[PDB]
């Protein structure tokens, strides 16, 4: 089944995502050309901790290393913050965070260009978001998530990138990952109908090449198999009577928190 959220747990909800969303948002200035993938993390483990007085979900998760996931160009997801991974001009970076509070995690990621960007990073950023976004205004109660799946891949296609299959939106509470898997491509095993109150998120990784993808010897670390560039952005959402509240919006995204289709 899929845990229908309580008004309070909505609450607390808001609240875990607001301090993700800020993180992102905190550490946006530090990412520039001669900075570490390694002093990023170390700011935004300070900041979730004596700050917003939460943890980090990743930190341990696992066994991974580190408190947020830092992916650089042609890496897909799950890079490991490193003192001597240096930012770039002409970069694309993910910052992947997600954070504890009172019980309920808050998850979100967004993409920054480092430097002068590359036009071509900017498009594939820019068109990953509005697969993201494109998703987020289809979802209300009743609307199967295999729509939503096929919606973000037919986009996304349209614009010669491709859709990884290997990882996935999911359900989100007291849990860092719970039911439904959320998937960001058709696939003929998906079959959840939306109901108000469900909480998920929504988080495409998109490649400009091939889709395929390959582990380093790290045992995290996930790049394209032709090394092309790939992007994400996530959000984490609750499903409203209506439509659905972004709980992790952020003062750059360029699209309402609130999304009613009464
Ligand atoms: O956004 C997510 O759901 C996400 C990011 C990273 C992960 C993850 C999943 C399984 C094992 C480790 C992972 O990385 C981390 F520990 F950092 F959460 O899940
Ligand atoms: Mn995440
Ligand atoms: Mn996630
Ligand atoms: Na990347």
């Known amino acids: ?10 609450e607390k909800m808001r609240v875990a995502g607001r301090l993700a969303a800020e993180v992102l948002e905190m550490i946006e200035p530090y990412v520039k050309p001669g900075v570490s993938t390694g002093e990023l993390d170390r700011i935004c483990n300070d900041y979730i901790v004596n ?15 580190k408190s947020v996931c830092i992916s650089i160009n ?12 240096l930012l770039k001009d002409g970069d694309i970076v993910n910052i992947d965070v997600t954070v504890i509070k009172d019980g309920f995690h808050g998850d979100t990621s967004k993409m920054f260009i480092v430097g002068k960007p590359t036009i071509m990073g ?15 205004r289809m979802v209300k109660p009743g609307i199967n998530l295999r729509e939503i799946g096929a919606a973000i891949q037919k986009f996304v296609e349209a614009e ?4 990884v299959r290997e990882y996935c939106g999911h359900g989100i509470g007291r849990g860092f990952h719970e039911e439904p898997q959320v998937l960001h491509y058709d696939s003929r095993e998906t079959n959840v109908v939306l109901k108000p109150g469900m909480t998920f998120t929504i988080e495409p990784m998109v490649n400009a090449g091939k889709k395929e993808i390959r582990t380093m010897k790290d045992g995290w670390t996930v790049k394209t198999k032709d090394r092309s560039l790939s992007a ?11 439509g659905c509240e972004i709980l992790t919006l952020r ?3 360029t ?8």
């Open 232 to 242: 994400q952005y996530e959000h984490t959402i609750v499903v409203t009577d209506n």
């Open 1 to 10: 089944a899929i845990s229908i959220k309580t008004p309070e747990d909505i």
């Open 74 to 85: 042609e890496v897909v997801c799950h890079g490991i913050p490193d003192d001597a991974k």
């Open 51 to 65: 700050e917003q007085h939460a943890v980090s979900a990743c930190l341990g998760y696992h066994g991974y290393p």
């Open 122 to 136: 900017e498009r594939l950023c820019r068109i990953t978001q509005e697969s993201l976004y494109l998703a987020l």
């Open 255 to 262: 699209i309402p928190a609130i999304i009613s289709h009464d």
């Open 251 to 253: 003062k750059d995204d």
């Open 160 to 163: 010669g990138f491709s859709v």
